[PDB]
Design a binder for this molecule. Structure first.
Ligand SMILES: C[C@@H]1CC[C@@]2(OC1)O[C@H]1[C@@H](O)[C@H]3[C@@H]4CC[C@H]5C[C@@H](O[C@@H]6O[C@H](CO)[C@H](O[C@@H]7O[C@H](CO)[C@@H](O)[C@H](O[C@@H]8OC[C@@H](O)[C@H](O)[C@H]8O)[C@H]7O[C@@H]7O[C@H](CO)[C@H](O)[C@H](O[C@@H]8O[C@H](CO)[C@@H](O)[C@H](O)[C@H]8O)[C@H]7O)[C@H](O)[C@H]6O)[C@H](O)C[C@]5(C)[C@H]4CC[C@]3(C)[C@H]1[C@@H]2C
Ligand SMILES: C[C@@H]1CC[C@@]2(OC1)O[C@H]1[C@@H](O)[C@H]3[C@@H]4CC[C@H]5C[C@@H](O[C@@H]6O[C@H](CO)[C@H](O[C@@H]7O[C@H](CO)[C@@H](O)[C@H](O[C@@H]8OC[C@@H](O)[C@H](O)[C@H]8O)[C@H]7O[C@@H]7O[C@H](CO)[C@H](O)[C@H](O[C@@H]8O[C@H](CO)[C@@H](O)[C@H](O)[C@H]8O)[C@H]7O)[C@H](O)[C@H]6O)[C@H](O)C[C@]5(C)[C@H]4CC[C@]3(C)[C@H]1[C@@H]2C
Ligand SMILES: C[C@@H]1CC[C@@]2(OC1)O[C@H]1[C@@H](O)[C@H]3[C@@H]4CC[C@H]5C[C@@H](O[C@@H]6O[C@H](CO)[C@H](O[C@@H]7O[C@H](CO)[C@@H](O)[C@H](O[C@@H]8OC[C@@H](O)[C@H](O)[C@H]8O)[C@H]7O[C@@H]7O[C@H](CO)[C@H](O)[C@H](O[C@@H]8O[C@H](CO)[C@@H](O)[C@H](O)[C@H]8O)[C@H]7O)[C@H](O)[C@H]6O)[C@H](O)C[C@]5(C)[C@H]4CC[C@]3(C)[C@H]1[C@@H]2C
Ligand SMILES: C[C@@H]1CC[C@@]2(OC1)O[C@H]1[C@@H](O)[C@H]3[C@@H]4CC[C@H]5C[C@@H](O[C@@H]6O[C@H](CO)[C@H](O[C@@H]7O[C@H](CO)[C@@H](O)[C@H](O[C@@H]8OC[C@@H](O)[C@H](O)[C@H]8O)[C@H]7O[C@@H]7O[C@H](CO)[C@H](O)[C@H](O[C@@H]8O[C@H](CO)[C@@H](O)[C@H](O)[C@H]8O)[C@H]7O)[C@H](O)[C@H]6O)[C@H](O)C[C@]5(C)[C@H]4CC[C@]3(C)[C@H]1[C@@H]2C
Ligand SMILES: *[C@@H]1O[C@H](CO)[C@@H](O[C@@H]2O[C@H](CO)[C@@H](O)[C@H](O)[C@H]2NC(C)=O)[C@H](O)[C@H]1NC(C)=O
Lengths: 197, 483
């Protein structure tokens, strides 16, 4: 029984590993947008970093673990594992791009919707054209991004997000690309990490 | 059709290796020259004279502070900060009511402070804790009795104030100082205002603001204070005006993500080269490709700025992303093709055999990248019509260069290798230049006894930032003594 337990070890081990990773990311990335909070009793340093509350990072990383343990096992059970570019370097490239785009999430201002379609279609498509040609991960990342979009768009209707203005299109145009990219990145992570042994 | 070209190119490189090394290194230095070092007169501190005039630069409002000190006999009874402080304010309130209602033949006949005093009631949200401490009618004057809404009767009728004034001191050593020390002015620790018997020097700091200075008012006012103050001091100076500079602080968290990037980047490196630790050769081999691509982007920056076409961007925040995009497989795809070749003499032939074969694919990959980037530039978005140019230049440079410098490094390397040191020394020097341009990532990292701050705080409280602006201070004194 020690063997299958060592298997379960490897399995949830990698999950905790990339859970910490998803957290690290969400922290850094929330911190990216620089709000000017002039208010009295200015913020203490760690509070400026550890923003929001315990609600956010555990969920973000739970999603990462879901993804990393999902994308490899599906191809383990359906077809053959992946081998296109699967060495850490390309994983790191994907991660850096995932970071850069989100850094482009706020510091641009577009002319017209056609410019956003014409460019984001190509961008998302490429980020699958380059690090995973699997149709499976494609149709799965698209799905989970769809659903993250919908859950967000209906939860704030009760209210977590707390923004309400003509900018209601940002979400309907920009974020699903983020989560799309995130699913794919985390997938390549899970692959490169599980095919160690 | 073309492999003959790259074939002769290998004949050319190993034939004239070192001159090519010189050309490339010195153009590298020609591009990495300016960046790491490179109608207003002087926005920074430039004090001239009180009898003078400003730089005539608005948004810049000057505040005047008044210092006053009370003394009791080295011997007295019931020394408490209540009674020794009240009579000072017994006079302070009279002085406030004189200045606020200062009747005098100013430029506007019988004028008062209000006519030019910064009149504005911009009360911001977070003022809840002090909805009764700052003026909102139409005056900008700060005194400790402000807490009492300009009521001296309440002041000299209350049971106690020490705790009440304490009421808003949260904690110790906070960058946002307080409101108490402000309307005291004199820092109870630097001024030394402590409940000490037979050695006490209580002081009250007063503040004021204005747009245009007219000494026709203030000099005549001082004519009143020469009689009102009547203290024993020689302070008088002459004419010297000080203009404090408003420096803006980039916090730390605002800095974190950038650094994350660089961390990621270094990993992209260590992992590339583990592909090369396999083959029989030294570590520095890998070095050659590292310094090169980088030196290219750096080089690119130099030719991207001076032409005059990067007016809104820096490298420390973008440069990595290129090392991410174009990558290094474009130099190892051929390296492995070289070492994979037969062990023959005159490497000039081995490389012209393998590199010649991989030329086709390298050109295809290049044209692919250029298609991508040309699509981007075709877009009318301007910030991308910028970055695409960084890209194209870094790319064409990496290409037009790698065949020259790295190719020659490999030549001399396998020369010294199959046979058995300007090469490694010039390599170390290129790496020093690289680490230097790296430590030059800062391009994106960009009276006086008073505190470091609490000057902008006031303006921060009114949807107004004074970081761009400058402030000036002039002083007057009025002190008292009795038993
Ligand atoms: C699988 C993994 C899991 C984890 C993860 O990866 C995948 O999931 C991802 C996903 O989950 C991510 C999140 C998705 C949602 C993101 C939202 C984003 O906030 C949004 O930022 C946008 C930036 O464009 C908009 O803000 C506008 O941005 C414009 C572009 O510059 C501004 O120009 C405009 O300002 C307004 O411009 C017009 C003028 O007329 C106005 O005067 C001026 O204000 C801003 O809009 C407003 O701008 C203001 C000033 O900057 C405030 O920012 C305000 O916000 C409100 O400010 C109020 C002030 O009191 C406050 O009370 C209130 O609460 C705030 O809402 C904001 O609206 C928008 O609007 C604002 O929302 C935030 O940056 C990052 C964000 C969170 C992301 C964090 C990182 C994540 C978690 C990712 C995370 C890694
Ligand atoms: C094919 C694939 C695609 C994907 C990719 O690969 C290939 O392509 C690449 C490409 O996509 C890349 C992105 C492209 C866009 C890039 C944009 C760039 O942002 C720039 O960052 C600069 C930093 O100095 C400036 O931003 C300033 O940053 C300061 C420091 O934080 C702020 O302090 C200030 O904002 C000020 O804050 C205080 C307020 O009081 C002021 O009101 C406000 O201004 C900002 O400056 C502001 O930045 C704004 C950005 O929109 C405007 O420039 C604005 O100026 C005015 O803005 C108005 C509205 O836009 C405009 O109408 C007006 O004319 C302008 O005068 C300017 O004040 C500048 O500005 C801003 O651009 C960012 O660093 C990297 C970036 C994200 C890139 C990341 C990596 C990528 C993703 C790459 C990616 C791999
Ligand atoms: C794996 C990845 C995931 C992500 C992704 O890839 C795969 O998935 C893809 C997919 O998911 C895409 C989304 C699909 C849904 C898309 C919806 C789309 O909205 C529609 O966009 C159209 C243009 O393509 C029209 O928008 C008009 O755009 C013009 C500018 O070009 C404006 O000019 C005009 O507004 C009007 O201009 C003229 C003035 O005189 C008017 O005063 C003014 O109103 C707009 O149209 C208006 O736009 C407004 C704000 O956007 C309102 O929506 C309004 O609503 C109207 O309200 C009326 C009320 O009586 C009603 O009668 C009428 O019917 C409604 O239309 C609508 O008119 C239309 O209009 C608007 O809706 C948006 O542009 C892009 C969109 C988000 C897409 C973003 C990119 C995606 C994510 C893709 C993305 C790559
Ligand atoms: C398929 C699966 C689905 C699920 C999932 O995986 C894939 O999908 C992913 C995706 O879906 C993700 C979500 C997408 C939407 C995201 C929305 C985002 O909200 C934004 O978060 C930003 C973070 O900075 C800003 O929030 C403000 O951040 C400021 C600092 O930068 C604070 O300053 C301010 O709080 C203010 O501080 C000063 C005080 O004076 C104010 O009183 C207070 O407001 C904050 O804004 C506050 O944010 C709070 C929660 O973080 C509250 O919302 C609060 O509003 C109300 O405040 C009341 C105070 O009494 C309180 O009682 C009440 O409860 C609150 O509602 C709101 O002001 C911004 O502004 C806000 O928009 C949230 O951070 C994370 C978020 C949800 C994400 C979490 C992780 C996910 C889910 C992922 C998840 C794993
Ligand atoms: C207080 O901030 C507000 C909101 O930014 C500023 O008022 C606005 O001015 C800007 C452009 O300068 C616009 O974005 C808004 O449309 C304006 N809205 C208004 C007038 O409510 C205002 O400039 C700031 N106030 C002061 C004193 O500077």
């Amino acid at each position: 029984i020690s063997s299958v337990t060592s298997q379960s070890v490897n399995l949830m081990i990698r999950g905790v590993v990339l859970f910490f990773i998803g957290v690290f990311l969400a922290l850094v990335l929330n911190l990216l947008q620089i709000q000017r909070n002039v208010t009295l009793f200015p913020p203490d340093v760690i509070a400026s970093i550890f923003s929001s509350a315990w609600w956010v990072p555990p969920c973000c990383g739970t999603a990462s673990a879901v993804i990393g343990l999902l994308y490899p096992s599906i191809d383990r059970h359906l077809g053959e594992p992946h081998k296109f570019k699967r060495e850490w370097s390309s994983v790191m490239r994907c991660v850096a791009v995932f970071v850069g785009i989100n850094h482009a999430s706020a510091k641009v201002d577009f002319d017209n919707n056609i410019q956003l379609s014409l460019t984001l279609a190509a961008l998302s498509i490429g980020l699958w054209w380059t690090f995973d040609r699997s149709r499976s991960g494609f149709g799965l990342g698209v799905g989970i991004a769809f659903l993250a979009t919908v859950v967000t768009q209906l939860l704030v209707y009760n209210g977590v997000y707390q923004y309400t203005s003509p900018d209601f299109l940002y979400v309907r145009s920009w974020l699903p690309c983020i989560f799309f990219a995130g699913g794919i990145t985390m997938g390549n992570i899970g692959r490169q990490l599980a095919m160690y042994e | 059709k073309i492999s003959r070209a790259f074939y002769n190119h290998g004949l050319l490189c190993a034939s004239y290796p070192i001159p090519i090394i010189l050309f490339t290194g010195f153009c590298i230095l020609a591009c990495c020259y300016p960046l790491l070092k490179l109608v207003d007169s002087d926005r920074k501190q430039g004090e001239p004279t009180e009898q003078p005039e400003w730089y005539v630069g608005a948004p810049v409002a000057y505040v005047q502070q008044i210092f006053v000190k009370s003394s009791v006999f080295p011997w007295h009874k019931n020394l408490l900060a209540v009674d020794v402080f009240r009579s000072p304010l017994s006079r302070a309130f009279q002085l406030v009511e004189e200045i606020r209602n200062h009747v005098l033949r100013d430029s506007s006949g019988i004028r008062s402070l209000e006519e030019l005093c910064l009149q504005v009631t911009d009360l911001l949200p977070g003022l809840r804790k002090l909805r009764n401490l700052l003026p909102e009618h139409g005056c900008l004057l700060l005194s400790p009795g402000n807490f009492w809404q300009n009521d001296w009767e309440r002041f000299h009728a209350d049971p106690d104030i020490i705790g009440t004034i304490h009421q808003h001191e949260p904690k110790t050593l906070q960058t946002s100082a307080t409101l108490k020390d402000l309307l005291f002015g004199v820092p109870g620790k630097y001024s030394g205002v402590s409940l000490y018997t037979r050695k006490r020097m209580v002081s009250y700091t007063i503040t004021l603001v204005f747009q245009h200075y007219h000494a026709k008012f203030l000099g005549s006012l001082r004519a009143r204070l020469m009689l009102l103050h009547p203290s024993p001091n020689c302070s008088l100076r002459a004419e010297s005006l000080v203009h404090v500079h408003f420096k803006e602080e980039i916090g730390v968290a605002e800095l974190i993500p950038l650094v994350t990037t660089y961390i990621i980047l270094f990993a992209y490196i260590y992992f590339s080269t583990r592909k090369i630790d396999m083959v029989k050769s030294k570590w520095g081999l890998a070095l050659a490709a590292v310094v090169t691509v980088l030196s290219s982007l750096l080089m690119s920056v130099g030719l991207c700025t001076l032409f005059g076409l990067t007016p809104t961007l820096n490298g420390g925040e973008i440069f990595p992303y290129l090392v991410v995009v174009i990558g290094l497989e474009n130099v190892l795809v051929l390296t492995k093709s070289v070492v994979s070749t037969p062990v023959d003499l005159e490497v000039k032939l081995r490389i012209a055999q393998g590199l010649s074969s991989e030329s086709w694919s390298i050109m295809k990959n290049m044209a692919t990248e250029l298609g991508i980037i040309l699509i981007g530039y075709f877009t009318l978005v301007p910030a991308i019509q910028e970055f695409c140019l960084f890209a194209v230049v870094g790319l064409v440079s990496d290409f037009f260069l790698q065949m020259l410098f790295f190719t020659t490094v490999l030549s001399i390397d396998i020369r010294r290798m199959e046979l058995a040191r300007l090469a490694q020394r010039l390599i170390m020097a290129g790496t020093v230049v690289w680490i230097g341009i790296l430590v030059y990532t800062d391009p994106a990292g960009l009276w006086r006894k008073l505190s470091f701050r609490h000057w902008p705080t006031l303006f921060s409280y009114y949807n107004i930032t004074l970081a761009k602006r400058y402030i000036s201070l002039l002083p007057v004194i009025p002190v008292t003594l009795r038993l």
